[PDB]
Every structure is written in C-alpha cells, then in structure tokens.
Amino acid sequence: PFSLLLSKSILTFFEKARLALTIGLAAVLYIIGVPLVWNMFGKLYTMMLDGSSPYPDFLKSLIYGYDQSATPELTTRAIFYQLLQNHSFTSLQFIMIVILHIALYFQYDMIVREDVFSKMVFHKIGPRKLLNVIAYFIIAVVFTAIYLAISYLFPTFIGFGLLKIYFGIFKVILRGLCHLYYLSGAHIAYNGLTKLVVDVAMSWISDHLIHDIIYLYNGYTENTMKHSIFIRALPALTTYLTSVSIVCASSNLVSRGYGRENGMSNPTRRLIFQILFALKCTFKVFTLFFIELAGFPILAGVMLDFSLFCPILASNSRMLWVPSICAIWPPFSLFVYWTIGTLYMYWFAKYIGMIRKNIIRPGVLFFIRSPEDPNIKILHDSLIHPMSIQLSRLCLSMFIYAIFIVLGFGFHTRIFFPFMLKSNLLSVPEAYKPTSIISWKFNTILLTLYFTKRILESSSYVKPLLERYWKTIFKLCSRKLRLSSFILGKDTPTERGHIVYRNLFYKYIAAKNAEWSKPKTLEQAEELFGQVRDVHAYFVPDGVLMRVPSSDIVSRNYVQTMFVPVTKDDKLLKPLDLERIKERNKRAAGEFGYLDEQNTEYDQYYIVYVPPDFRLRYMTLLGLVWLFASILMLGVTFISQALINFVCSFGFLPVVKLLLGERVYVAWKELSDISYSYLNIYYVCVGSVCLSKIAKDILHFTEGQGIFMAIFNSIFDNLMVFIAIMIAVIRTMVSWVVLTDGILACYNYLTISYTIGNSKWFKYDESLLFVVWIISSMVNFGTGYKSLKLFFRNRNFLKTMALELFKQGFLHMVIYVLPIIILSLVFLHGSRSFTLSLNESMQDIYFGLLIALESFTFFFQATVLFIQWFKSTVQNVKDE
C-alpha cells in the first residue's frame, strides 16, 4: 500500500519536473539567446564593415558596441542594466520586419486574387524532447546568421558605390547648372535684393539651415557620426529604393514590343512578366493605401498640435508640445499624433454627415466620398487609374485640411487673444500645466474630458438643438449671400437681381430711403433715373440658370457633361462639343480606360440658379461658417466656466469658511481667484453638463444620476486583465514582503551575532531578498496563470464574475496579511528588521510569538500535504 503510493508520487514528481525543465529551458533559451545572437551578429557585421572597433578588449566591444553616451563598466549591475536595452532593440526590429513582410504578402495576394488583373495582363501580353529543443536552436542561429549576412552586407556594399555615383552626379549637375544660371541672369536680382528691404535675414537662416546639411554630409564621409540610426541605415535605404525602381522599369521595358494583336509564345518570358507586373501593382497599391491611412493622420496630428495644443497647454513661445511630454520614449510621439489626427477626421466626418442629409440639398457635395455609395469598389478602382491622379487628389485634400486647421485654430489661439485682445483666457495657469504623460495633471484632464464626452454624447435633447442652430444660421447666410437656391433648394425671385439707387453717395447713406422710393434693363433704368428723380430702384436679373447633379454618388464619367448654362425651356444656351470631352476622358482614363464599368443608375439633373461671379460667394460662405462655429464654441466655454465659478464661489466657499477655519480651503481660494482671468477644464466640463440639462429644459419648453452608470455598464460590457493583475501583484507583494520579513527572523534568532555575522560576509543582506523575490515571482506567475484560466473559463453575469474575482482576491489577501496583522498586534521588515538592525541594543514575548506563529504555519502546510498525499493514494487504490 505505502510502497505503491510512494512509487506513484515519485513518478508524478519526476514527470512534472522533467516537463517543467523542458518548457523552461525552451522558453528561456529562445526568448533570451535568439535576440542576443541577432544583436551580436549585427554588431560583428557592422564592425567588419567599418574595419575597426570602438574599443581596440573584444568582450567590451560586444555589450556596448557603438552605444554612445554610455560610460563602460564591467560590474554585474552595469551589465544587467545594459543588456536589456539590446534585447528591446532587437525585439522591436524583428517586430517591424515581420509586420512589414506580412502586410506586403497579404497585399500581393489580394491584388492577385482580383478578377481584373487577368484582363490587365491579357491586354498587356495578348493571347498565346530536450534533444529536439537543442537542435531547434542551432538551426535558428544559422538562419539568423545567413539572413543578417545577406540583407545587411550586400545592400550596404552596393549602396556605398551607389551613393558615390549619386553624390558625384549631384555635385556635377549642381556646380554646372546653378552657377551657370546665377552668372547669367541673377545680377539684377542681386542688385534689387541689396536694398529692397531681407537679404541678411534670409541668408542668415538659410546658412543656418544649410549648415545642417553640410554637417550631415561631413558625418557620412568621415567616420565620426557613428551611433546614429540614420547614417547607418542610409545605404540600405538607397539600395532598396534603387532595386524597386529597377524592378518597375524592367517590368515596363519587358512589357513593350507586344500587344493584343501579337502575343508572347515563349513560356519562359511569361512567368517573368507576370511576377514583375504583380510586384509593380503590389508596390503601387501598398504605397497608396499606406499614405491615406498613416501619413495623413500623423501630419494632421502634428498640425493640430502646433495650432491648438501648444498655445494653450504649453507656452506661446514654443512651437510643438507633444515631443516634450514623452521624453521617456521619443518614438512614442508617433502614436499620439495618429490618435489626434484620426479623432479629428472622425469628428469632422460626423459633422459633415450631419449637414449632408438635413439642411443642404443632395448634390452640392459630390467631390467628397459618400459613406453609403452602393457601387463603390475600394480596391478594384485603385488599380485602373494611374498614380498621378490619385496622388494629386490626396495632395489637394491634405492642403485643404491644412488651410482649415491651421488658419482657424492658429488665428484663434495665437494672434487674436494673446496679441490683439491681450488676455490669457485661452491659457491654462502655470500650476496646472501638464508636463509629462505619467503624471496626475494630465491623467485627470484626460479622464475628465473623456467622461464629459461620454455624458454629453448619449444624453439627447442636444443634437436637435445643434441641428436647429445650424439650420437657422445656414438659412440666414444663404438668404443674404444670394445662394438661396443653389445650396438649399428653396428660392424667391427677389434674390435674383441687384438694383442701383439714384447716386452712390445716396445709396450708401440712404439705401433704405432709396428702396422706399416691374423688371427693366440697365439702359432703361439709367434713362428712368436720369429723367424721373422718383424711382430710386430698378430690377435686372443678371443671372443664369444652370444644370447640376441630383445626387452625391453620380458616375465619375458623367460630371463632365454637367455645369452647362441652360435656358428656361431646358434648352442649352450654347452647343456643347463632344470630341473634346471624349479626348479628355480618353486622356484621363489611361491605357486601361475600357476596363471600368460605371453605375449609371443614380443619374439625374436639377435646374438651379447660380449668381454672377460664382467663385467668391462660395468662399465667403465657408468664412461665415468658420466664424459662427467659433462663436458657438467660445460662447459655450466661457458661459460654462463663468456659471460654475459663480456657483462654487458664492456657494461652497462661505460654507467652508464658516465650518472650517481660515486654513483644503487655501487651495480652493487660490484656484477660484485666478479663474477670473484663466482657463479651467474642470469648470468648463461641469458647466457643459449643467448647460446640457438647462438647454434640454429650454428645448422641452421652447438622466439625473441613474442613467449615467446605466449607459456606462453597457459601454463597459480592460477590467478582466487589470483586476486579475492587481490582485496577483498584491498577493505577490505581500508574499514577497512576508518572505523578506520572515528571512530576517532567523538572523535575529541566530544572533541570540556569530552565525549572523559569519553569514553577513557573503552578502547575506541581498541573497535572501533575491531568493524571496524569485519565489514570489514564481508564485505570482502561477496565480496569474490560474486566474487567467478561470477568467477564460468564465467568459448579472458581470456581477457574478466580479464576486468570484473578489472572493478569490479577498481570501488570498486575508490569509497572507493575517500573519502580518497578528505580528503587528504582537509588536504593538518591521519588527524583524528593527531587531536585526538593533546590534547595539518585553521583546522576549514578541520573539516567542513569532516563533510560535511560524510553527503554526508550518504545521498547517504539512497537514494539507498529508491530506493531499492521502487523496492521491485513494485515487491510486481505485485504479489498482
């Protein structure tokens, strides 16, 4: 009986130990060795390329290598604190490489799978165990060595000569052409600029900027500008770009010679042509889809930063703000810009969508893309059209967005208030200016803004008010700017025709009187004014009716035949040619112009009125829209802040002054005294929600506390990982401290310090702490694995899951902290650390209690083990 149970326990323990050793060895070996061998081979190859070593001792040249601004040190701490950065560097490089390769392959597969690529190529060509783990590391090392050798020695070796040739060509062309042009016809320009104003100011900053280019050029040609990612990456970049250009040019050149009337009969050339064409299309589509999704949001974020976030949160003298807060990791500045840009695009799209289907007639916005768009192929349309047209469209869109963002926000927060009005009302005070991304002044603002957005979004009775305001101001603007019919649909004849009074001086001063003083003609009106001095007004339309589309999703090949003057009987005033239109369509369509099918279903035309000089009246409208949006935003913000300041200061402050003495009160008194001339985010948010309630009441006439969390619960239906991680860490922290505190108890007992003194020689103050930390880390890993498994298994429902997590967390925390609490009660680190440190110095009872408490803990563990062992034996008995 006992022998069988012992044998079974030994077998189970041996199997578990073998499995654990195998998995630990595999994981540690891979995750640690492979990146480190990658970095070692990279350093070795860079050293071989350069021809010399930074430290002409080999070993010190492999840990630091070319790392500048880092004094070397051979201590173990100074090696452990350095070898983590190398691992992070290699991990990041591998992640980027893998992501790029995956994206490229997926794009190529999607392009090849399309049904138009076959037609395009037809047009172009024409008709016809421990040992296993050990062995799986050497192969990875060899593959890393080979891939690194190829991809980091061939491109650089070719790129050296490529940069030599490029630099020579550029220098020759510059020195020739620029100097020839300057010597020929620049004397007059120099004479004019000598005393035009400017030359000193322009040349000073020009040579200052030109010095940087000269400085960078010297760094590459003379090996002094090492330790920089750019200077080391440039030859590989140029080699890859030249290879891509050569591939595309070779595809185009091989394509030539044959067409649809004389196909290719050589099977060898067909495969080469197909692969080259597929690569060309993959590169084109990847560039086009990368620009719109990553390059434009980042630029928009940078622009929005420089225009709005720097003048308010930071000082006005500086240009950019984001690079300062994220000084811990500068590359992380690339994510904040993207987030800001995409949020701006999302909100602008929402606003445009609101205006589209409520106020303006359908047809005034066809250049912007439409969300519904039943006949919209995002990928098939990106292959047919050439690259130039799409690039031009993207550039124009970016320029328009630049005008909007920069002009609006910059003029409002940089030139109007700080200079023309001389006020700080858009400047956060000094004491609450964010300075870092892991502080409280930033997190509080972020959370307040997010929760105010949540409360104001799903609240109702505000969107109808916004729509009413927008409709009213649009009616007001379009009734006066003469664009009554073109933009809205409704119209009155009185909008067509501007009259002239008796005299310009009379018209300017007495326009109403002249109006108070029957269509006609300009000559007839002049004759009547010159003959009878009684009619100070006339009527002459001076407007032409036009033909406009009737939907925002009309076909691209049809818009060309619209926008032509039409008389009152649906008859064209002048004939419209067709040969020029056909030639323009053929030229703009490209070679594959006949591969595109146009959905000519939603194709109608309206009859509207357009006023004379129809190029400034639809820019004044945008100006007025900007003005009114700014008025609304500024009014809301200032009113909210003023209302909250009034309420707080004339409410709570006297109450606190009466209850608590004139000594929390101090901070609230200063914060409510500068807010009369500065901006406050929290007051603005609170006033915004209060005004939301008030405006809901106003709209009702002319969600108190419960609906808030009601919607929040549905929103939250992040917490699964955070709760488990915190609970596991808290238990680990208590266990680590208890183990550290328990370790010192033995030293005190040993002193009662011969053994303690003898042990202290071999770093006894840190070995026990390290062992306790390792044990606590292992326990935390096990607990976290168990918690993750339980959460995945258990994936009203939230309350039950929260109760299970709370019960598990509370039970572990209570048991772990109970011995500490009992020790703390007996005392009333900690007592053990005090006893250890009291080498130069009641306590007997406390010492006895600690020994007694330790015995109880050991006895409990042994009883559980005996019960667990007996349970295993019972299962073994049933099996036998």
Swiss-Prot record:
Q: Which residues lie on this side of the membrane: Lumenal?
A: 42-91, 151-152, 307-319, 420-436, 640-670, 740-767
Q: Where in the cell is it found?
A: Endoplasmic reticulum membrane; Nucleus inner membrane
Q: Please describe what this protein does.
A: E3 ubiquitin-protein ligase which accepts ubiquitin specifically from endoplasmic reticulum-associated UBC6 and UBC7 E2 ligases, and transfers it to substrates promoting their degradation. Mediates the degradation of a broad range of substrates, including endoplasmic reticulum membrane proteins (ERQC), soluble nuclear proteins and soluble cytoplasmic proteins (CytoQC). Component of the DOA10 ubiquitin ligase complex, which is part of the ERAD-C pathway responsible for the rapid degradation of membrane proteins with misfolded cytoplasmic domains.
**SMART domains, alphabetized:** RINGv
Q: How does it assemble?
A: Component of the DOA10 ubiquitin ligase complex which contains E3 ligase SSM4/DOA10 and CDC48-binding protein UBX2/SEL1. The DOA10 complex interacts with the heterotrimeric CDC48-NPL4-UFD1 ATPase complex which is recruited by UBX2/SEL1 via its interaction with CDC48. Interacts with its associated ubiquitin conjugating enzymes UBC6 and UBC7 with its membrane anchor CUE1. Interacts with PEX29.
Q: How does it sit in the membrane?
A: Multi-pass membrane protein
Keyword Zinc-finger set for record = yes
- Species of provenance: Saccharomyces cerevisiae (strain ATCC 204508 / S288c) (Baker's yeast)
- Which family is this sequence assigned to? Belongs to the DOA10/MARCH6 family.
Where are the bilayer-spanning segments? 21-41, 92-112, 130-150, 153-173, 286-306, 320-340, 399-419, 437-456, 619-639, 671-691, 719-739, 768-788, 808-828, 847-867
A GO MF annotation of the entry reads: zinc ion binding
User: Which gene holds the coding sequence for this protein?
Assistant: SSM4
Q: What is this protein called?
A: ERAD-associated E3 ubiquitin-protein ligase DOA10
Q: What class of enzyme is it?
A: transferase
Question: What keywords does the record list, in alphabetical order?
Answer: Acetylation, Endoplasmic reticulum, Membrane, Metal-binding, Nucleus, Transferase, Transmembrane, Transmembrane helix, Ubl conjugation pathway, Zinc, Zinc-finger
Please give the biological process terms from Gene Ontology that the record holds: ERAD pathway; protein ubiquitination; retrograde protein transport, ER to cytosol
In the record, what lineage is assigned to the organism producing the protein?
A: Eukaryota, Fungi, Dikarya, Ascomycota, Saccharomycotina
Which reaction is the catalytic activity of this chain? S-ubiquitinyl-[E2 ubiquitin-conjugating enzyme]-L-cysteine + [acceptor protein]-L-lysine = [E2 ubiquitin-conjugating enzyme]-L-cysteine + N(6)-ubiquitinyl-[acceptor protein]-L-lysine
Pathway it belongs to? Protein modification; protein ubiquitination
For side Cytoplasmic, which residue ranges?
Answer: 174-285, 341-398, 457-618, 789-807
The residues the entry assigns to the signal sequence are none
EC number, UniProt record: 2.3.2.27
Domain remark text: The RING-CH-type zinc finger domain is required for E3 ligase activity.
Q: Which cellular component terms (GO) are annotated to the entry?
A: Doa10p ubiquitin ligase complex; endoplasmic reticulum; endoplasmic reticulum membrane; membrane; nuclear envelope; nuclear inner membrane
